[PDB]
Each structure stands twice: as C-alpha cells, then as structure tokens.
Amino acid sequence: TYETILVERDQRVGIITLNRPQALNALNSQVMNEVTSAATELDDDPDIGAIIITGSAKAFAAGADIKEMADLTFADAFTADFFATWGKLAAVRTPTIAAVAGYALGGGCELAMMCDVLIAADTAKFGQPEIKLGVLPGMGGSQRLTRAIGKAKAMDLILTGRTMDAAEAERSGLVSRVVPADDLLTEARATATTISQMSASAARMAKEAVNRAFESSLSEGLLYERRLFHSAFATEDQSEGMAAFIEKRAPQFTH
Amino acid sequence: TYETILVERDQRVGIITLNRPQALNALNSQVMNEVTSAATELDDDPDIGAIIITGSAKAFAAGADIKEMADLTFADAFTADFFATWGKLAAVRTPTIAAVAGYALGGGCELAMMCDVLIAADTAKFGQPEIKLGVLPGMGGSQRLTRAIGKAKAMDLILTGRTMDAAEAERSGLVSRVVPADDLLTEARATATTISQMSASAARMAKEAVNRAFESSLSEGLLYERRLFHSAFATEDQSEGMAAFIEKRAPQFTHR
Amino acid sequence: TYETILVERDQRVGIITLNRPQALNALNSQVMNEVTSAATELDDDPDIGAIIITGSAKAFAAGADIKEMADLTFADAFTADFFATWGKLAAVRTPTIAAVAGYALGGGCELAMMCDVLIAADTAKFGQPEIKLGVLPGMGGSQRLTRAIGKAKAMDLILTGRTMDAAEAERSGLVSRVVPADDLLTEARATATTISQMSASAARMAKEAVNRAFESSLSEGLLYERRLFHSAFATEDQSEGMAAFIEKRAPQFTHR
Amino acid sequence: TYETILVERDQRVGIITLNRPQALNALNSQVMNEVTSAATELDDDPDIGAIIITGSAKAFAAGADIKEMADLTFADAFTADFFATWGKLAAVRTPTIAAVAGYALGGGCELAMMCDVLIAADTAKFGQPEIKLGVLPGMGGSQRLTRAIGKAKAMDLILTGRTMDAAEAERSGLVSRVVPADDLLTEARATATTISQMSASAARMAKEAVNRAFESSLSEGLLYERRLFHSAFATEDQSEGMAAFIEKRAPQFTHR
Amino acid sequence: TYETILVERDQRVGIITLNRPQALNALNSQVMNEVTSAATELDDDPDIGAIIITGSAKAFAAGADIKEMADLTFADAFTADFFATWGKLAAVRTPTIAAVAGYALGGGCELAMMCDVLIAADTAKFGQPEIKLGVLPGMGGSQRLTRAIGKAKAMDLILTGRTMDAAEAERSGLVSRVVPADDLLTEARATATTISQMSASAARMAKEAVNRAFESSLSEGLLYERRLFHSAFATEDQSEGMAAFIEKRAPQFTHR
Amino acid sequence: TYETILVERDQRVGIITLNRPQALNALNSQVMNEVTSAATELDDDPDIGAIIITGSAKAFAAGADIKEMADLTFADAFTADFFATWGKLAAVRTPTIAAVAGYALGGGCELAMMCDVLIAADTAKFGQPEIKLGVLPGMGGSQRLTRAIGKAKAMDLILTGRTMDAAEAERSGLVSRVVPADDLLTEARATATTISQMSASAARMAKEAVNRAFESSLSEGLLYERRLFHSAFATEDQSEGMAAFIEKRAPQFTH
Ligand SMILES: [Ca+2]
Ligand SMILES: [Ca+2]
Ligand SMILES: [Ca+2]
Ligand SMILES: [Ca+2]
Ligand SMILES: [Ca+2]
Ligand SMILES: [Ca+2]
C-alpha cells in the first residue's frame, strides 16, 4: 500500500513506478519516503537481483513540490536534514536501473543519476532548473552531473537551467543507452533481467567496486578492487560460472 | 585603463576582452595581472552577476610570450611562483563564461578551462602544444583537460601537441556549447545575461557546489552541497524565487 | 627470450606485441610477467622514448586464461597478490600507447586502459564480460573504465557484460583516436615516433602530471603541476625548446 | 524493552548503559542493534542534547562474542554486511560521550572510539587483542586508533595485542580526560550536562565540522567549516548567544 | 603605520605584535586585514627569512570582537566571506612562528594554529569557547585543532569550551615547545633567527612539503616531497650547503 | 654476501643490522639497495613472519653520504628518481620493526618511520637536520614525521634541525615504546617473536588495514577494513585461533 508509487515483482526484477501523473511525477517528501522504503525492501529480498525505477512516457519526474520548501528556514532544513533520506537509495546494494522517458528535471534528474544504470528513451529531457527558484541542487546534482558530463556542461545546465536532450546526454556521459520511446520499458526490463540472472554477490561486488571510483584516489580504488577480486574466489558462484562457460551452457547461480 | 585587455559593463554583465592583436592574444605576465585584476574588481561589484572572457574572431589566446620564460632558472620560477596569480581567476565567486573563437592554445586553452562555462565558435581550435618547447602545461592543463576529456585524449593532446576542433571538444567534455562563429559573442552575451539575472546568491552557491566535485570524495561533495542547499533557505531570494513560481509571476531578486 | 610476446625497437620506439594467437592473445601470469619485464627494460633504456603495446588484427587481447583462476583459494590469492604485478606497467615513466585492433575484452580492455594513449582500429571491441562467469575485474577495470566513460556506461558494461564498439568508445572517453584497421600499426608508429622525438624529460613530466589528475584534489594537482613546471626550467630541453621557437628553427633535444 | 542495555534520561542527557555483566559487557549482534536503536531514538528526541554510552566499573566492554563469528562463511558475512549497523552510531548528530571504566578491549575499544568525547577512569585498559585469535578489527579499530595515536603505537597494539593503560591513552590522543574510577560517572554526567545545555544547533554543527577533519583535505575542511559557520548566523542561538555575551548575562538558548 | 599591530624588522626576522591591549588582543576585521597585509609584505621581502606573530604577556589573543558579528545574517556573512582573508596568512611562503603567552582563545587559538611553529609560554592557555556564544569555530579550529590533538580532545575542547594549559597542549600535539614565560620572546627570536639563517629556498620547500601532509594521501605526499627534493638540486644553496658540510666550513647561502 | 648490512634469521624473525660503524651507519645508495633487497627476500620467505631493522648502540643511522648528492643536478636526480627505491621497504607486506638506539637522524629518522613498529632505546635521538645542508627531507620525513607528531613539532624539527629525545618522541606519537638501552634488542626480538607467531595472513591484513588510515577518507578506510574483516573468515587460521582460545592453549597457525 503506497500512495505515490507502484511496485511490481517479475522473476528477479523489482520495478518501482512513480505514480503522480497529474503532477508530472514531481517529487515530494512522500515520494522520497515511499521510493526509499520500497527500494530498501527490494534490496533485502533474496529473490530480487535488479531494481528498476521509472515514471511515465511524459515524465520520469518533472521537478519537485515547491510548497513543501517555500516557507523553510535554514533551521527547519538543517533540523530535518532535508533530502538526506534519498541517501537510502544510493545505499541500496542491488543494482538499480533508471528507465527515463520524457522530463527528468531537477530532483527527477538527480533521482536518475543516483541509480547505477540509466536507460533513456529518445524523448528524455534532462535539466537542473531550480536556480530559477533561487536555490541550487539539493539531491546531489552538482556532484553527480558534474562527474558524469564534465564541468563545462554541468555549469551550463546548473547556472542557466537549460535542458539537455537524450543525444547530448548520451555523448556526454550521463546515460548508459538511448532507445526508442516505445521500447524503453522492454529494453529496461531486458537489461534488468540480464543483471538479475548474474550471481547476486558478483553483481553487488562489481557495483561496489565501480562506486569506489568516486570516493578515493585511483591507487586506493585499484587496491580495493583487487582485494574484492580475490574474495570473489571464496564464493561458489565463480566455480559454477566457469563450469557453464566451459560446457557452453547458461549458468545456474545460487546467489 | 589596461594595456592588454578591454573591459566593458552592460547591465549585470562584465566583459573582459583580450587585446594583444599583434600577438594573437598570446598570454604574458601583464595579461595575467590585468585579467585577474579586472575579474576581481567585477567580482566585488554587486551590479555584476556574470563575467565573460573572450578574445578576437582569430584567437581567444594563441599560446604565451616565450621570451618571458626562455631564460628562467628553476630558482627564478620558484621565487616568482610563476603563473600562480592565475589562481585569482579560479577564486572569482561570480560565474565566468569563456567565449572562445579561433585559437585557444597552451595557456589560452588553460585560461578557457579556468572559466565555469565555455561557449565555443565552430572555428575554435584547442591544444596544449608546449611539449614541443620542452615543457609541460603550467596553468593547470594537465589537471583540467584530463578531468574534462579523460586520460586517453588528454595524454594524446599533451604528448603530441595535436589540435582538437570544436566538434571533438564538445563531444569529449571540454565545451558547454558550440555555436556558429558569427553568433559567438551574441550567444555568450545571451548566456551571461541569463546567468546574471538569476539570484546572485543562488548562482554563487551553485558554482561553488559544482567546483567541489573536483576537490573531494563524492560522499563529502554530497554533504557539502546539501548543507549549502540548507543555507539557501536563509536567503531572501529562495523565498522570493519559490513564491514567484507558486504565484505564477516573475521573481524580483535582490541578491541576498 | 620471451615465450608469449615479441619485442621490437625502431629508433626511439619500442613495440611489445602480444603473441598468443592460439588463445586470441588471452592474458595469463606468463604474459603479465613478460610484458611488465619488457616494458620495464624499455623504460630504463635511454634510447627509447615511447612504448607501443599491441596484439593482432583479430584481438588486442580477448580476456584472461580461466584455468589459473579456478585453481586457487583466497589465502592463496592474497599471498600471491594475484594480478598485482600488472602495476609495474603503470609505473613505467616513458609514454605508453595501446594500439588496439579487434577484441580487447576483460583483462584485455584493462591492459589497454593502463596505457597512456589508446589508438583504436575501427574494428576494436571493448568490454568487461567476466561478470558472466561470476568473476570481477582484477586489473583495474572498475576504476579506469568508470573514470574514462562515466558511471552510467561503466555500470552498464560491467554489470551486463555488453561490448562497446570503437565509435562509442571514442565519443565516451575511452580512446584517443579511431583509425581504419589497415592503418592502425602505421598510425600507432607515427604517434609513437612523434612522442619519442619530444624531450624525454618534458614527456615524462607531462605524463606524470596528467596521472596526478586521478590521485588527489584538483587543488593539489594544480600545485603539483606548477612545481613540476617550475622544475622544467632547470632542464636543458626547456632552454633549447624555447630558444628554437624564438629563433624559428627545429629544436635539437638532448633529453636532459 | 531492551535485553542487553539500560537507557536513562536526566534532563537533556540520555545514558545508554551496557548490561551484560555475565559476559563483561561483550558486544554481539543484539547489543549492536539495541545500542544503535536507542542512540537513534535519543538522537531524534529534541529534549536530548547529549548521549553517554557506558558499561560497568569492571568493563566498558571486554570484546565481542566469539560464537557469532565462527558460525558464518564469507558470502554470508558479505550478504549480512556483518558489523555494518554500528555505522548508525557514527551517524548520530547529537554529541556522544563514552565513559570508559576497566576493560575496553577489541570491539569495546572500537565502540569507545566511535563516540565524540571519551572520558576514561584511571582503571581503563584499552586494546585490540583479537589478532591473537587470528581475527581482525571489524568496527573501525584499524582506522580510528591509527588516527588517534599514530602509526607506531597503533601498529604495536594491533599486531601484538598489548593493552594500553589510561595514562598512555591520554598522552597518546585516544582519550579526552582521565578521572578517578569512583568519579567517572559523576564527571561524565557533568560533561554531558555542560554539552547538553549548549545550543543544540551549535553543538551539532561543531561536531559535524570536527568530523570533517578525517574525511577530506585540510583545504576542503576549512571551507566546509567556514560555510557552516556562516550558516550559524541564520540561527536564533547565534543571535542570543552573542547578545548575552555583550550584555553580560547568561544566554537563554532555544535550540533553533 | 598600523592601528592594531606593531611591526619590527631585525636582520632577517620580522615580528608582528598584536596591539589591542584594551581588549587583550581580541581579533577583529581590522586585525585580520593588518596582520595579513603585514605578513604578505614581509613574505615578499627578500631580506626576511622568518616571521614571528605574538601578543602580550597577558594574551596572545583573547577571542574576538563580538559586536562585529552579533547582528550578522547568513547573507551578510556569505557575501563578506567572513574570515576568508585569514587564508592569506596560511598562504605565506616564509616560515611563521607563533609566540604564545597567556590567553590564546577562540580566534586567538586558531591564529596560533595557522602558524608553522608554535612556541608557548608556560603561562599559555588555549581554548575554543565560542560554542558558548552559539557558534562553532570559524577560523579553522575544528580542522587544525583536531588534526593536532586528535578527535577526543578536540571534541572535548570545542563542545565544552574548556581551556587547555601549556603542559597538556605540548603533550597533545598543539605546541612545538614550552618555555618559561620570561623567556618566551627570547626563545621565539632565537628560533626565528635560526630559521632565517637557513637557505630561504630550502626553508620554503620544507614548509611547503610539511603542509602537503594535510592535503592528500600519504602516497601523493611522498611523491610531492621527493620531486620537490629533486628540484632542490637545481639550487645554488643545495650545492653550497653540501659543499660547506663536506669542506668543514660555514655555508654562505644566497637564497637561490 | 652484503657489504653494508648483516642479515640473520632466528625462527620466524629476520633481523637486518646496518653495518657501517665508522660512518655511524650513515645511509648511502648501497645501503638502500642492500636493505631493500634483504627486506624483499625476507618478505617472500614463508618461514619469516617479522622483520627487524636496527643499527648500533651509538647510531641506528646518522644521516647520509653527502658526497653522493653534492654534485647532483635536478636532471640527475629526476632521471635517477633518487631515493625512490626506498619505497620497496614500505611495500614489504610482512610486519617490520625498527629497533632504534642512539642517532636516527635525517635519512635514518626516515628509515625508522617507514617501518610499522618503532621500539626506541632511551638513548634514541631523532632529527631531520638536512635543512642545514640546503635541502629538505627526501625519504618521506616531511610526510611521516608530520603525520606522527603533528604540524607544530614537525615544523620545528624540520625548519631548525633540532633533535628530539626518546621521551618527547614517545609522548608525541613517533615511537611505539621506549625501553632501556641495554634491553633494546631483547625487547625488539620479543615483540618480533610475538608478531611472527600470529597468523601470517592475519598480521599482513591488519598491517594493510592500518596503512589505509593514511591513504583515504575515514569513510573509505572503514569500508576497506570491514571487507578485509569479512575475508579473514575465509581462512583456516581464524578457526584454529578460536579453538586455541576456547581450550586455553597456544594456537598453532599454519599461516
Ligand atoms: Ca563524451
Ligand atoms: Ca526561507
Ligand atoms: Ca632554464
Ligand atoms: Ca544572525
Ligand atoms: Ca601525544
Ligand atoms: Ca646541484
């Protein structure tokens, strides 16, 4: 029973769909709490190996509920640690896939960037326009956008509020793949299926290793990866993976 | 009255134009001192919300004055802290826009990369060729180029001295937008106007937050941004910006 | 005498060619030891200024031998520090160029990423497919890929095992330049020649500076580069390089 | 209802007392879940301004239960992320004080180090002896000990398993203050009272700033602190605190 | 002619003496501007090799002028970048020595910590008490105190406002040496003289290298130091220093 | 056959003793090469679990051979990467113990700081005096001294060249323990014996974890430690360690 989202399970794939169509899936505190609660529940479910987050064909998530912020003081925001709960999504250990159609603006752009894989429809429009409302990004946009697309384009988007289409996003580093709008959900599901049929521990360790690339020097990331790599050979799925390859068959991992 | 640059102010936009046409705007010590002095002055002017740096249609800046460096010893360079003063431009709090036409080579490329936004003419040509003079980049090119375009291309440019055209620069991460050469100054001024009409507080905070992305772990950058975002709720412009949006009217920012 | 590679010297260019056609140039512990040994020997040779690593037209390197990995436990892997020796290649001070044709998959992709410059044939195919075997990258793939092409694409490649063609690799940050397959070795030799004819001191310093971009804050990288730049003024090649420019002649470098 | 701890509230001070005398307050998964749950609940209570964690006169906490650790494999440890939940204690925003009497060994030493302030009885004994069981620190001991007392002493403690008495701990960086054993709880309550009667906003900001000192370069830490300091001028307690000082009266804080 | 400080030069030693005796040398905006201006001027003087900052026998500096802060909004503080100018003292390349007698509280403690060497009178009293005024440290105390004395003691000082005497400061990491109060200025001048008679290049490099220890990983700091050390071999003072040692004579440094 | 050092093995302890008594064990290129070669050989020997480095009662190592540096140009030093080979000592995976009596000055101070554990005789005198020779530390002193004893004291030592006695070094963070001069070698051997009788892999992992505390943020060090911790339970020695404790006997690790 969620009020702002829909959750479905199909095999080892969980799908969270934002469900505020009249508001173009704009994020509010309720969406934050529901999305993070569902994602965390899915993350702890051993029968789920990949999580998709998506919106509608018109909008993945177009901005935020401004009435919830308009009257905040610094003290209000600091005491609430406003938006901190979104960190629960980045903390999810299972691979997450943002399937982005139409508007992914402000908080919606930031939500997409929090996921590991980002599959965009050719209709995807990305932006961080809230400078127009007298504030800066507050859900990590200044950090993740910049790391994805570089300073020049991040500054342009964040200081002007201009939109970036799917093609620009794909050649700039923001998205994994662009697909036709009509195929977005099919393609996202296909990718989620592939990832969910990997070893759960291997896919988690791989994700963890990639995430280290933003948290330390290359020298420390290399050491971390190697130690993780060594540990993957303390697992049963590695031996099954190698058997399947030799026998030219599909692996049957126990996760 | 500067010797090597021209400075103009219109509304909330300041424009610094490199002006050594006899040398295709090659950078020297005087250009460094004047550009930084002018940018710092504009930064402290409350009636300026954006700063453009640009050169000519032939060259943003084509390298450096080599005679100023040819005879230097290590002691000379270390004592002078040669090039350190360019750090004053990075320290400017107001958003800066590089409008790059023609050659942006060596120091010129590094100057363009110091700015926040980079709008390039389709004529723009970028490079870091001073390996051919027996030195490496000294104005941050090895750091900013690599972060913008990745190791493989940065190494290629820096070790071979090859130029990169505007199309390659744009798909590689170095430039914000490419526009036709005839429209460069018009487009740059339009972008600067847009930025200068934003809340000065919000724009300063947004720029500062973006800059943190290169200075610490993602985890620390995220905390910094969130706290700066919380601070924004103590500003008049946060209240007015959101009120104006809710009330379907134009915001009247006061820059506080 | 090497069993798995060939080593050639042409003027100031060394070329290491992977030579296991029976295994599509799959890497193993022997290839690791031989490549790193050869590269280190070339690195210490004052008559070499650039090093090319390459495979065949069909494969740069298609992966790693499975046999070796299934054989050991964790305490054994930890005690052997399996794959750590590849770090010797990153420690090479002389510029390195990967000339990649055909498959560069898994360890092969990782090897190419260890080099400074990466020139790809239009036939090149990159990827990290070993997740399909329940096996993680152990040669820096999770680190260098992510830093080259960004999180979204790196997560996609590493979690799904999909390949990336040359055009995508070029527009994403992974490769320096794409050239026709028939021209790969010619183009790589030309690039290596160009780099090897630069000042050895300037090239080494430039490479070292670029590498700093992944190891510290931008602020520290800028300081490191500026100080290395200052040191360059103690070198003969700085003096000659700049004198030659001013006097309109070809520089005559001594690599000092 | 807790099984392994007691929780008390006295004005603005919360006190969590480890209560497993039969095991010298050895930590286990149940103690981890209960301590973190209690601390989080206290952290979210606006009527609490400081949190004390303490054990008995004989032991703060003598280690961790061996039973739980021998029970699992690696894939199980990784899937459970064994000990990760202790991170909730580090995430507490309200100031925390460890009042340590007697044994604080292994996980017990690590728990004390997670707190902001550490007041030690003269009877306190610290150490990381689990290397003797072939077991590594898993609660941050290799990180916090080293940062507190330096490499030489941390390597000594962690590799040999030797204990460190209160005097050595105080002169080495591990503890805030040493007091007589009979006075520990009185002194800890007095310190907690003092902290809890400060502005809740100022105390939280100060703690957060100090914590930054271990997460980034000094340059970034200085910037973070200065900006948090700037934000403090949006708080009522800054206004009242400074007004009270100027008017020579006791400040009357509202924790806003 | 400064208002809040006195400046004296003798041989290669400059001395800045805080001079607000009516306020026990409490820091205000004017002190910040004058101290930084004077230090920057001394830094650029080739006949100065060391800079002392000191106050009176009663107080190095006892806090700050609170009236200047009491009425500030966040916007006021952010726009002013309140306290940022103190960064100019950290940017001084010449070695700085704080000679601390009596109270060094709040900003005064932070000022002492900005210097390279800290010589304390046995009368010295350190603290960071502005939590009692509803704010946290704003001049780097949360960063430098914590790095000097460790988390437990820094948290204790900053959250309670308690003072730390010279003995505790010296065994905790905050001060270089403690001397009798009557000998403080004599000892500070002797230390400054010793430092000022070293090669100015070598002393600048040594200080810069030490400062890197707080800005990056150990691995990066080690590379930086080694490269700066290599650069030293381009200096006349390296040649003369080592020649003088080998030849059993006094070095004649030229500061290049 | 070494010219400047002596190497002995006793059970699982290797001992490297600097042997240039007429020069107060001053470091030169030969000592660097011999010490690093012996340490690396000992590190690869499965019958060695701890390595001691020591000098004489008068001097652990008093400075360096200045004639080897006096005539160097920047180009010479950069081309040689002068002193880089000392990095081989820090790269040793087995625990290293510096047993320091008398002078440990300049390079000798730096050599002591490169080791993991530092046991000092009460006669130990530490210093970094080479500012007097117109250079700064070149073997990591500016990095390791500062991290050990704090800025104020590191700056004092490095800018003035003053010496620091054993008592000051011990209360400042530089040394693990101070013992009487007559007991230095006995105490160092005792400590080395203790460490060498731990599980080889556990002692290596513990050392590795501690070393991370200087290479990244606390958040990243904590993650690294936990993953390492999890991996220690993929080893046989852990189970033996726990059996021995329960049975109140000495463990018999297989390393
Ligand atoms: Ca791109
Ligand atoms: Ca507000
Ligand atoms: Ca020169
Ligand atoms: Ca106020
Ligand atoms: Ca101490
Ligand atoms: Ca020389």
Tab-separated table of N, CA, C and O in Angstrom, chain E residues 164-226:
chain	number	residue	atom	x	y	z
E	164	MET	N	42.815	24.532	27.864
E	164	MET	CA	43.885	23.554	27.918
E	164	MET	C	45.158	24.334	28.262
E	164	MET	O	45.468	25.326	27.598
E	165	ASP	N	45.879	23.896	29.296
E	165	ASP	CA	47.115	24.564	29.707
E	165	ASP	C	48.281	24.130	28.826
E	165	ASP	O	48.149	23.202	28.032
E	166	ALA	N	49.413	24.816	28.962
E	166	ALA	CA	50.564	24.599	28.085
E	166	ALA	C	51.103	23.165	28.142
E	166	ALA	O	51.458	22.598	27.111
E	167	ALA	N	51.147	22.580	29.339
E	167	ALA	CA	51.625	21.210	29.503
E	167	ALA	C	50.779	20.220	28.707
E	167	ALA	O	51.316	19.362	28.001
E	168	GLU	N	49.457	20.332	28.825
E	168	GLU	CA	48.561	19.447	28.096
E	168	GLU	C	48.686	19.695	26.588
E	168	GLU	O	48.705	18.744	25.810
E	169	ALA	N	48.798	20.963	26.189
E	169	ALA	CA	48.933	21.320	24.781
E	169	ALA	C	50.181	20.711	24.174
E	169	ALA	O	50.134	20.191	23.063
E	170	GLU	N	51.285	20.744	24.916
E	170	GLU	CA	52.546	20.202	24.429
E	170	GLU	C	52.532	18.672	24.321
E	170	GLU	O	53.052	18.118	23.353
E	171	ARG	N	51.944	17.969	25.285
E	171	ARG	CA	51.911	16.508	25.177
E	171	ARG	C	50.813	16.018	24.232
E	171	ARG	O	50.785	14.844	23.884
E	172	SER	N	49.922	16.915	23.812
E	172	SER	CA	48.811	16.546	22.940
E	172	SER	C	49.047	16.818	21.455
E	172	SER	O	48.317	16.291	20.631
E	173	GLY	N	50.056	17.616	21.111
E	173	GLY	CA	50.398	17.856	19.701
E	173	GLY	C	50.246	19.286	19.207
E	173	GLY	O	50.610	19.591	18.075
E	174	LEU	N	49.729	20.168	20.051
E	174	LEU	CA	49.406	21.526	19.627
E	174	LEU	C	50.607	22.478	19.572
E	174	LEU	O	50.627	23.402	18.758
E	175	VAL	N	51.595	22.280	20.437
E	175	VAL	CA	52.706	23.224	20.503
E	175	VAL	C	54.051	22.553	20.274
E	175	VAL	O	54.252	21.376	20.591
E	176	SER	N	54.964	23.330	19.706
E	176	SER	CA	56.308	22.868	19.365
E	176	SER	C	57.162	22.708	20.621
E	176	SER	O	57.802	21.671	20.815
E	177	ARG	N	57.184	23.757	21.442
E	177	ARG	CA	57.990	23.811	22.664
E	177	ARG	C	57.287	24.667	23.699
E	177	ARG	O	56.603	25.645	23.354
E	178	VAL	N	57.476	24.325	24.972
E	178	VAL	CA	57.073	25.200	26.066
E	178	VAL	C	58.316	25.770	26.742
E	178	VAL	O	59.268	25.041	27.011
E	179	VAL	N	58.300	27.076	26.993
E	179	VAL	CA	59.393	27.757	27.682
E	179	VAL	C	58.850	28.613	28.825
E	179	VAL	O	57.664	28.959	28.844
E	180	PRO	N	59.713	28.950	29.800
E	180	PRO	CA	59.275	29.875	30.840
E	180	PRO	C	58.779	31.194	30.257
E	180	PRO	O	59.346	31.685	29.284
E	181	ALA	N	57.731	31.754	30.853
E	181	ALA	CA	57.096	32.976	30.350
E	181	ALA	C	58.072	34.129	30.128
E	181	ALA	O	57.969	34.839	29.128
E	182	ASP	N	59.021	34.312	31.046
E	182	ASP	CA	60.006	35.398	30.920
E	182	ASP	C	60.941	35.207	29.722
E	182	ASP	O	61.544	36.170	29.248
E	183	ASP	N	61.068	33.972	29.242
E	183	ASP	CA	61.992	33.655	28.152
E	183	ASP	C	61.313	33.519	26.788
E	183	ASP	O	61.993	33.269	25.795
E	184	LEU	N	59.994	33.692	26.733
E	184	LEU	CA	59.230	33.418	25.509
E	184	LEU	C	59.756	34.194	24.305
E	184	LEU	O	60.090	33.600	23.283
E	185	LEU	N	59.825	35.513	24.423
E	185	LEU	CA	60.248	36.343	23.292
E	185	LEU	C	61.700	36.103	22.895
E	185	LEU	O	62.028	36.145	21.707
E	186	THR	N	62.555	35.852	23.886
E	186	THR	CA	63.953	35.496	23.649
E	186	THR	C	64.061	34.178	22.885
E	186	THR	O	64.793	34.076	21.898
E	187	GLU	N	63.309	33.179	23.338
E	187	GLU	CA	63.312	31.857	22.710
E	187	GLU	C	62.727	31.908	21.294
E	187	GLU	O	63.286	31.323	20.365
E	188	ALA	N	61.624	32.632	21.130
E	188	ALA	CA	60.999	32.787	19.813
E	188	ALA	C	61.944	33.462	18.823
E	188	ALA	O	62.064	33.021	17.690
E	189	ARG	N	62.627	34.519	19.262
E	189	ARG	CA	63.577	35.227	18.409
E	189	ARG	C	64.790	34.369	18.073
E	189	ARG	O	65.306	34.449	16.960
E	190	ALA	N	65.234	33.543	19.021
E	190	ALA	CA	66.344	32.622	18.772
E	190	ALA	C	65.959	31.574	17.720
E	190	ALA	O	66.740	31.276	16.819
E	191	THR	N	64.752	31.026	17.845
E	191	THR	CA	64.237	30.065	16.869
E	191	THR	C	64.064	30.715	15.495
E	191	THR	O	64.470	30.141	14.487
E	192	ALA	N	63.480	31.913	15.466
E	192	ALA	CA	63.287	32.653	14.216
E	192	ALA	C	64.614	32.994	13.546
E	192	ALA	O	64.751	32.879	12.328
E	193	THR	N	65.595	33.402	14.347
E	193	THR	CA	66.927	33.677	13.836
E	193	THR	C	67.528	32.427	13.191
E	193	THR	O	68.033	32.491	12.073
E	194	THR	N	67.453	31.295	13.888
E	194	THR	CA	67.937	30.023	13.357
E	194	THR	C	67.290	29.703	12.010
E	194	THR	O	67.977	29.381	11.045
E	195	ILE	N	65.968	29.816	11.942
E	195	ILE	CA	65.252	29.528	10.701
E	195	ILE	C	65.602	30.541	9.599
E	195	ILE	O	65.792	30.161	8.444
E	196	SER	N	65.713	31.817	9.958
E	196	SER	CA	66.011	32.872	8.980
E	196	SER	C	67.426	32.788	8.407
E	196	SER	O	67.709	33.412	7.383
E	197	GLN	N	68.309	32.042	9.069
E	197	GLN	CA	69.693	31.899	8.618
E	197	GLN	C	69.872	30.655	7.744
E	197	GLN	O	70.934	30.460	7.134
E	198	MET	N	68.833	29.819	7.671
E	198	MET	CA	68.791	28.726	6.703
E	198	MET	C	68.603	29.293	5.310
E	198	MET	O	68.175	30.442	5.143
E	199	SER	N	68.936	28.490	4.302
E	199	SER	CA	68.573	28.805	2.929
E	199	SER	C	67.088	29.139	2.855
E	199	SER	O	66.263	28.352	3.305
E	200	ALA	N	66.753	30.286	2.276
E	200	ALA	CA	65.354	30.683	2.157
E	200	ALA	C	64.593	29.731	1.238
E	200	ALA	O	63.417	29.457	1.479
E	201	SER	N	65.265	29.244	0.192
E	201	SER	CA	64.677	28.287	-0.746
E	201	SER	C	64.397	26.962	-0.049
E	201	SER	O	63.290	26.439	-0.127
E	202	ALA	N	65.398	26.439	0.654
E	202	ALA	CA	65.249	25.173	1.373
E	202	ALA	C	64.146	25.263	2.433
E	202	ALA	O	63.316	24.365	2.531
E	203	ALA	N	64.116	26.356	3.193
E	203	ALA	CA	63.106	26.507	4.245
E	203	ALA	C	61.697	26.616	3.647
E	203	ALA	O	60.740	26.042	4.194
E	204	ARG	N	61.565	27.334	2.532
E	204	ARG	CA	60.262	27.441	1.854
E	204	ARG	C	59.781	26.080	1.354
E	204	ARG	O	58.607	25.733	1.499
E	205	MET	N	60.695	25.318	0.761
E	205	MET	CA	60.371	23.984	0.264
E	205	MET	C	59.998	23.038	1.405
E	205	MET	O	59.036	22.276	1.288
E	206	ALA	N	60.754	23.086	2.502
E	206	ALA	CA	60.500	22.196	3.639
E	206	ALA	C	59.114	22.467	4.224
E	206	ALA	O	58.347	21.544	4.485
E	207	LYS	N	58.794	23.739	4.403
E	207	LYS	CA	57.482	24.144	4.909
E	207	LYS	C	56.353	23.692	3.979
E	207	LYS	O	55.313	23.176	4.419
E	208	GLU	N	56.551	23.903	2.686
E	208	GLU	CA	55.548	23.531	1.694
E	208	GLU	C	55.316	22.021	1.713
E	208	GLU	O	54.188	21.563	1.637
E	209	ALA	N	56.391	21.258	1.826
E	209	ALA	CA	56.307	19.793	1.901
E	209	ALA	C	55.540	19.325	3.145
E	209	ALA	O	54.668	18.466	3.052
E	210	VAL	N	55.854	19.907	4.305
E	210	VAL	CA	55.144	19.573	5.543
E	210	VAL	C	53.647	19.853	5.401
E	210	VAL	O	52.815	19.038	5.801
E	211	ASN	N	53.311	20.996	4.813
E	211	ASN	CA	51.915	21.367	4.610
E	211	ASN	C	51.136	20.378	3.721
E	211	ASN	O	49.928	20.227	3.888
E	212	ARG	N	51.814	19.688	2.805
E	212	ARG	CA	51.146	18.690	1.956
E	212	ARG	C	50.627	17.506	2.762
E	212	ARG	O	49.720	16.799	2.310
E	213	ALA	N	51.218	17.267	3.933
E	213	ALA	CA	50.801	16.140	4.782
E	213	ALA	C	49.325	16.190	5.194
E	213	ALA	O	48.773	15.165	5.598
E	214	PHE	N	48.684	17.355	5.062
E	214	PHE	CA	47.277	17.520	5.412
E	214	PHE	C	46.346	17.631	4.203
E	214	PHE	O	45.145	17.820	4.378
E	215	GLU	N	46.883	17.486	2.992
E	215	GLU	CA	46.113	17.805	1.779
E	215	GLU	C	45.871	16.647	0.827
E	215	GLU	O	45.075	16.773	-0.112
E	216	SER	N	46.524	15.516	1.064
E	216	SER	CA	46.376	14.376	0.176
E	216	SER	C	46.754	13.073	0.871
E	216	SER	O	47.169	13.057	2.037
E	217	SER	N	46.614	11.974	0.142
E	217	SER	CA	47.050	10.686	0.644
E	217	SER	C	48.556	10.697	0.902
E	217	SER	O	49.306	11.446	0.287
E	218	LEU	N	49.002	9.844	1.809
E	218	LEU	CA	50.434	9.699	2.062
E	218	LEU	C	51.203	9.413	0.760
E	218	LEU	O	52.273	9.986	0.527
E	219	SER	N	50.651	8.552	-0.089
E	219	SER	CA	51.309	8.181	-1.338
E	219	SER	C	51.604	9.401	-2.210
E	219	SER	O	52.698	9.533	-2.773
E	220	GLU	N	50.623	10.290	-2.317
E	220	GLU	CA	50.786	11.528	-3.078
E	220	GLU	C	51.733	12.522	-2.415
E	220	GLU	O	52.553	13.144	-3.103
E	221	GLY	N	51.658	12.648	-1.089
E	221	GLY	CA	52.582	13.499	-0.333
E	221	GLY	C	54.032	13.081	-0.500
E	221	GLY	O	54.916	13.925	-0.651
E	222	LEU	N	54.271	11.768	-0.472
E	222	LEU	CA	55.614	11.222	-0.664
E	222	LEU	C	56.173	11.551	-2.046
E	222	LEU	O	57.345	11.908	-2.162
E	223	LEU	N	55.346	11.423	-3.083
E	223	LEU	CA	55.771	11.790	-4.437
E	223	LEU	C	56.074	13.292	-4.540
E	223	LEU	O	57.093	13.679	-5.105
E	224	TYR	N	55.202	14.118	-3.978
E	224	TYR	CA	55.401	15.566	-3.975
E	224	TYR	C	56.721	15.952	-3.318
E	224	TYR	O	57.520	16.725	-3.878
E	225	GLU	N	56.952	15.418	-2.122
E	225	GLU	CA	58.181	15.704	-1.389
E	225	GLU	C	59.403	15.287	-2.205
E	225	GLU	O	60.376	16.045	-2.312
E	226	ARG	N	59.358	14.086	-2.772
E	226	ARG	CA	60.518	13.576	-3.494
E	226	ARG	C	60.828	14.457	-4.705
E	226	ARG	O	61.988	14.746	-4.988
